Symmetry: D5
Subunit: 90 residues, 10 copies
């Protein structure tokens, strides 16, 4: 999954980017999923574990994001333009 072109036609660099990105996407999905489960959960202990797991995947996502940012000038530009501001995003 994620490979839309045969791997052997892709450079190792493109494949590492693929790895980081699909990993980031999966981390984000896990944030989303844990978060819905927290909201729907009844059992307090389970709810805490889910909110906990959820918040670690945020660290995972950030780490992958930063690795992407060091390898990708066009992305680094965009993260500079929007991240850590207070102005309207729109």
């Amino acid at each position: 999954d994620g490979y839309f072109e045969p791997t052997q036609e892709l450079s190792d660099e493109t494949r590492d980017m693929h790895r980081a990105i699909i990993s980031l996407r999966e981390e984000l999905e896990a944030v989303d999923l844990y978060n819905q489960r927290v909201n729907a959960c009844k059992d307090k202990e389970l709810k805490a574990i889910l909110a906990h797991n959820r918040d670690e995947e945020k660290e995972h996502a950030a780490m992958l994001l930063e690795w992407i940012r060091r390898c990708d000038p066009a992305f680094d530009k965009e993260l500079k333009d929007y991240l850590f501001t207070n102005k309207p995003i729109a």
Copy 2:
């Protein structure tokens, strides 16, 4: 649809958070798939289109991420810890 719990059991703010995450996920996927296609592409004009679109999707991602950041203090703490650093992320 990415909705793993029935929608009627999730609040407006959870649902918006979901709209944002999945939108971000789809944008990153676009970047990845566009990158793969750019690498594999033969027609030079097509190639220029795919790379143009890939770099725009980067903009969409940045925007969605920042909105997530502004109402997610836990995500915020982490991005401030790693974004724009020079040190070994994990190593």
Copy 3:
């Protein structure tokens, strides 16, 4: 994917075409998806970001489809008959 035949049995031409159509299908799907999220969205700022991404995806779609017609005369004709007209599409 989107490849129903082994990639190695198709020409660079059929594959560049494939690249083009699949990208356009994904840009269209995103228009549609952002449209739905815009309608159902609550937070004004998110709705604005969702609308801004969606419309930008419209530019992508349009650029990809120009590439298609410029090397597809069977399609460039269809667009010629229907696009930018007043006539009942029927």
Copy 4:
């Protein structure tokens, strides 16, 4: 099915636009698929059948697209920035 938000939370014209877009995606897929089968086909008679369906689906697409165009001015603005031109698209 391609509905990512509950059907009851979407207006009728959002749902018509969805029906138009998904239909257009399907036809486009058809063109792409038929193109692959054409390229990879052996039997000459099956081959002719496939290519016919294909160029026919091109019509269906053109149809849906103009219908989308009537209804979406942002989209109209864009097709009129790019269609039937001669200048490098991004390039």
Copy 5:
């Protein structure tokens, strides 16, 4: 998923042309069912006519395909003989 459940390299050109024909038929048929459901659910009249128009030609697309199947499948042919254009109960 290509509808190939066995490696292509282990199937003859014939089996592969047949598969091309069947999977193409399945696809036209689906678009019929889909367009059908979309016609019924549709609200906008002009969209509706287009959806109906696409659907009927996909019926032509379908019929060409199953004829091609017939001419190169004695077992299928026989069965279409037995039941098509008929009026006795189907049991």
Copy 6:
């Protein structure tokens, strides 16, 4: 079964026609698939089981299709105009 619009927004007539088409599309898939397994099969006894069930599915398909055309004047018309003929089916 494979429904792109909510069941409650679809008449019983459109829903039976859907039950008919999807069943047909399954039967046809089981044909294409048994045919692949037949070509790939090593064991003789299994070969025969596979081919047996394959030819029978063609009846099931037959059959369901007759049912369709009886309530689809447009599919009826496309059938008569391509089936059992010996002309080249595409230009």
Copy 7:
């Protein structure tokens, strides 16, 4: 589909078993699907067809399950223990 390890890592035997088990799974799903479509069907003629196709496919299941037994001693044991008995299954 159904192959979770590369086909070139599997013996012809394992692959014929796989053929048999996936085909059995498919016949069974048909029966289930046909049974739902009967439970839900409105037109009578279609119903008879659906039930007809359904019951034929149970044969296809039995034929495959037999094939499996003759070459799976461990499966041959378990079927001897439970099938055609009047004793309770579990507790």
Copy 8:
């Protein structure tokens, strides 16, 4: 999930038949997968674990299938004819 019609339109005993069939299909899949895995496996201890589970799922399948036959006389007629037999299952 294997429900092709809305659950609200199926009777309870159809839903129970569905539960049986789908669980049987899952147990049969686990047999197939564990078989493929045993064939490909490298570590001896893991191998034995995979082959263990595989055999027990064969039991799980036999139980379920006894349950289906005892309330589907049509599955019975066909089971009685083919199970434990010498005759070539097909020809």
Copy 9:
């Protein structure tokens, strides 16, 4: 299913660990599905086979995990911190 990198690119070891993990996942999925079926079932006999199959799959699961614990000192560490405890699993 399971393989996101070409198999030719992964070691026998990584691929055995993949075989163990995906097996464990399938067996846990079997438990969840049987559990849901047990809850929704309206026939006592079927219910009993459902519930039976479901409790044996717990054992399959358990064997598979033990095999993982042995080969993965990282997984062993985490299992020892939390398994058979009484304190809150979390609140962070």
Copy 10:
């Protein structure tokens, strides 16, 4: 979404168990996927991230499974049984 039966037919306790199990399956998938990416990765910095994330997902998993143990006596049994032992697991 992992629900095989409508959620309105499942108790809160079956749904929490579902929430636990599926979360546990996802964290295990993560381990597996990270393992494969580690093996295939080229860039050493990314690699350290992947293995970091991977080993943290192991804790997530341990946690969930400790939760399941605490309310599944048949599970808090196989685990007392097999876990932290040196016996041959199967045969």
